[PDB]
Amino acid sequence: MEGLAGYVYKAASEGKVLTLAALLLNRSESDIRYLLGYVSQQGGQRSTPLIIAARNGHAKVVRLLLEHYRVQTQQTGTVRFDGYVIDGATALWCAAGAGHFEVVKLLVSHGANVNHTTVTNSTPLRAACFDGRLDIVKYLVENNANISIANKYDNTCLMIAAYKGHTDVVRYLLEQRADPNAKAHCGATALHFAAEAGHIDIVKELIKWRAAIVVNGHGMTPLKVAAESCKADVVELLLSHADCDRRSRIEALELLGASFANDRENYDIIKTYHYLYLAMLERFQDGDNILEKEVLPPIHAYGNRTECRNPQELESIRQDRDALHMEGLIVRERILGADNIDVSHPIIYRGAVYADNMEFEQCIKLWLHALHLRQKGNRNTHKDLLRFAQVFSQMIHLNETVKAPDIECVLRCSVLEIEQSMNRVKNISDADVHNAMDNYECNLYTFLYLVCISTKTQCSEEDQCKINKQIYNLIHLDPRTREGFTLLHLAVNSNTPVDDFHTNDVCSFPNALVTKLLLDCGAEVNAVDNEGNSALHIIVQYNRPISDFLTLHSIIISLVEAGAHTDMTNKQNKTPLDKSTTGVSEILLKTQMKMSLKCLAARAVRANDINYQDQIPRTLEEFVGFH
Amino acid sequence: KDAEAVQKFFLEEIQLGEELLAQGEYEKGVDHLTNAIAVCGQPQQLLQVLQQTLPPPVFQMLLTKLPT
């Protein structure tokens, strides 16, 4: 039964029609009826034989299932392609999602549903348009596919084809009276996607078909979207739309020139100067209607440079490349605004090249502004803090100095990010809980790298007090990892991950300085993880007792001087003396260990299995609980 | 004589028939299908399915070969 059904599924995955011509034949009626509709899990996906047969595009097995058995054609299943897993699928949806036209024709001709959506409300027409084939979309439309049906994220049939760049598909869709003035959750109107993907033909087709040139939710028209992504051709096409007025034309030219200055793919600074100069000429082309530039406060992050107001100023920086980068940053931040999504990415990149040419001061200056802009947008800042840790550790490795206010600012940003990550983890149910937990652990490790770097610098008294205040503000929250490790537990752990890029040179765990700083700031020295190990348990469980004997010596001394119990028991009921894997660490801990008659009595009670529950005082109910 | 063992036998027979039939060994495929039908004495279901799902030439040969 189950084994034969699995064999049927395995053969139908390869489309072995002759194998299914015996595995599902010469039987009774109801014995194989369940087998035809039996979902089989394989490769991390769940599907019926019809669904996987249409996914692999084998027309013979699908035709035999649709003719000689009359299997119901609205079955549900999962999706392996499109980068993710989509449930609630359909045989027709899986067939149209790969371009197999004959199985789609057979399914529609024998009773499948053309509008059978998924968990994301993706109609089969959307899958066929995402694949890009035109004939299947034509047939599916001719069989009443309801071309105006959107998805869960409101991406209609036209927008996905416009983004993917299938000009024949968008031409046919606009031919069949689709909705060119569509909308989405982000406000994209099927022309923002084409401009973002930089497809000149689809933009031309949508313009010819009376598109709506309307600003989306993020405050960016498709013209400004194209200028944001350095797409000169899309800007040139959208700029002759005869309704762009004059302010938006010069704004588009300024944004395009600004984006060309610090885009990794399209870096061309001559193009930047010339587009900015064209914009300035168009501004200064009228005697009495000089479209004077909006005044901007001089941001300290860009060397206190202001935006150029006249072409006389722009002629003086045509050869100042390190000033043209700042001009591009200033212009695109004025145009896109501080709250836009795509502002932080160039600011990081212009930082990164400054990090490449051993010029880390301007790198920190740009990256801190990028971090602040990304922070006051509730975006994801887990990677920017890691970049800060890497650049700080590369500064320390090359015998350079790190400014203490910079470390204080990065530590404050990291603490705020860890707070937001805790809120996100405790708020998300199942969508990206693994991703959120991994980001949380990465943020915690980044904070530990930053604390190690702060210990490796020289800071003033007020700056050290600010750093310790931020560390204490984090510690009072008591962050935890997957295993329950606190900050001290990882700071005394040799198994704490350190990224290979430019942090192994400085941030080496376990680190005596980090442990002492955490204990002085007020870390829970008696804290335990889910396994029950204390910080002392982790540090005596160490494999380099001679190589960094000073480090182990200082960490054990600091842990016992902070007031940790030296005979605490984990979930396996092991004292740190027994957990000590090396003779040197055990000897050193035993020297540090001071006996207590209370500890001896508690250990005697735990060994004798005395019914101490509800008998000894409540505090001693905890004490005996871990000896 | 008609148990699961010979069932797996002619299952493999028609599997090789499919493989060599897509590869073009139509005489080998029709011989293997003859060996497959010569164990189950009344496969009416396959008698009707292979009249439809098979290509017209291979079953045109096989149906004539069945009296032989």
Swiss-Prot record, chain A:
GO terms for biological process: apoptotic process; branching involved in prostate gland morphogenesis; epithelial cell maturation involved in prostate gland development; proteasome-mediated ubiquitin-dependent protein catabolic process; protein ubiquitination; regulation of DNA damage checkpoint; regulation of extrinsic apoptotic signaling pathway via death domain receptors; regulation of ubiquitin-protein transferase activity. The record marks D342, V343 as: Cleavage. Zn(2+) 2 binds at C186, H218. Keywords: ANK repeat, Apoptosis, Cytoplasm, Metal-binding, Nucleus, Repeat, TPR repeat, Ubl conjugation pathway, Zinc. Disulfide bonds: none annotated. Widely expressed. Highly expressed in testis. Weakly expressed in other tissues. Zn(2+) 1 binds at H185. It holds the Pfam family Ank. Pathway: Protein modification; protein ubiquitination. The keyword Cytoplasm applies. ANK repeats lie at residues 45-74, 87-116, 120-149, 153-182, 186-215, 218-248, 483-527, 531-568. GO terms for molecular function: death receptor binding; metal ion binding; ubiquitin-like ligase-substrate adaptor activity. One of its GO terms (cellular component) is nucleoplasm. Activity of the CRL2(FEM1B) complex toward FNIP1 is inhibited by BEX family proteins (BEX1, BEX2, BEX3, BEX4 and/or BEX5) in absence of reductive stress. Mechanistically, BEX proteins act as pseudosubstrate inhibitors that associate with FEM1B via zinc in absence of reductive stress, thereby preventing association between FEM1B and FNIP1. Zn(2+) binds at C186. Changing D131A: Abolished binding to -Gly-Leu-Asp-Arg C-degron at the C-terminus. TPR repeats lie at residues 344-377. InterPro entries: Ankyrin_rpt, Ankyrin_rpt-contain_sf. It is found in: Cytoplasm; Nucleus. Component of a CRL2 E3 ubiquitin-protein ligase complex, also named ECS (Elongin BC-CUL2/5-SOCS-box protein) complex, composed of CUL2, Elongin BC (ELOB and ELOC), RBX1 and substrate-specific adapter FEM1B. Homooligomer. Interacts with PPM1F and PHTF1. Interacts with the death domain of FAS/TNFRSF6 and TNFRSF1A. Interacts with CHEK1. Interacts with NKX3-1. Belongs to the fem-1 family. This is Protein fem-1 homolog B. It comes from Homo sapiens.
UniProtKB/Swiss-Prot annotation, chain B:
Ubiquitinated by PRKN during mitophagy, leading to its degradation and enhancement of mitophagy. Deubiquitinated by USP30. Belongs to the Tom20 family. Keywords: Isopeptide bond, Membrane, Mitochondrion, Mitochondrion outer membrane, Phosphoprotein, Protein transport, Transmembrane, Transmembrane helix, Transport, Ubl conjugation. Central component of the receptor complex responsible for the recognition and translocation of cytosolically synthesized mitochondrial preproteins. Together with TOM22 functions as the transit peptide receptor at the surface of the mitochondrion outer membrane and facilitates the movement of preproteins into the TOM40 translocation pore. Required for the translocation across the mitochondrial outer membrane of cytochrome P450 monooxygenases. Its main location: mitochondrion. It is found in: Mitochondrion outer membrane. The chain holds residues 61 to 128 of 145 of the full protein. GO terms for biological process: protein import into mitochondrial matrix; protein insertion into mitochondrial outer membrane; protein targeting to mitochondrion; tRNA import into mitochondrion. GO terms for cellular component: cell periphery; migrasome; mitochondria-associated endoplasmic reticulum membrane contact site; mitochondrial outer membrane; mitochondrial outer membrane translocase complex; mitochondrion; sperm midpiece; TOM complex. There is a cross-link at K1, K8 (Glycyl lysine isopeptide (Lys-Gly) (interchain with G-Cter in ubiquitin)). This is Mitochondrial import receptor subunit TOM20 homolog. It comes from Homo sapiens. GO terms for molecular function: mitochondrion targeting sequence binding; protein-transporting ATPase activity; unfolded protein binding. The keyword Hydrolase does not apply. Forms part of the preprotein translocase complex of the outer mitochondrial membrane (TOM complex) which consists of at least 7 different proteins (TOMM5, TOMM6, TOMM7, TOMM20, TOMM22, TOMM40 and TOMM70). Interacts with TOM22. Interacts with APEX1. Interacts with TBC1D21. Upon mitochondrial depolarization, interacts with PINK1; the interaction is required for PINK1-TOM-TIM23 supercomplex formation which is critical for PINK1 stabilization at the outer mitochondrial membrane, kinase activation and downstream mitophagy.
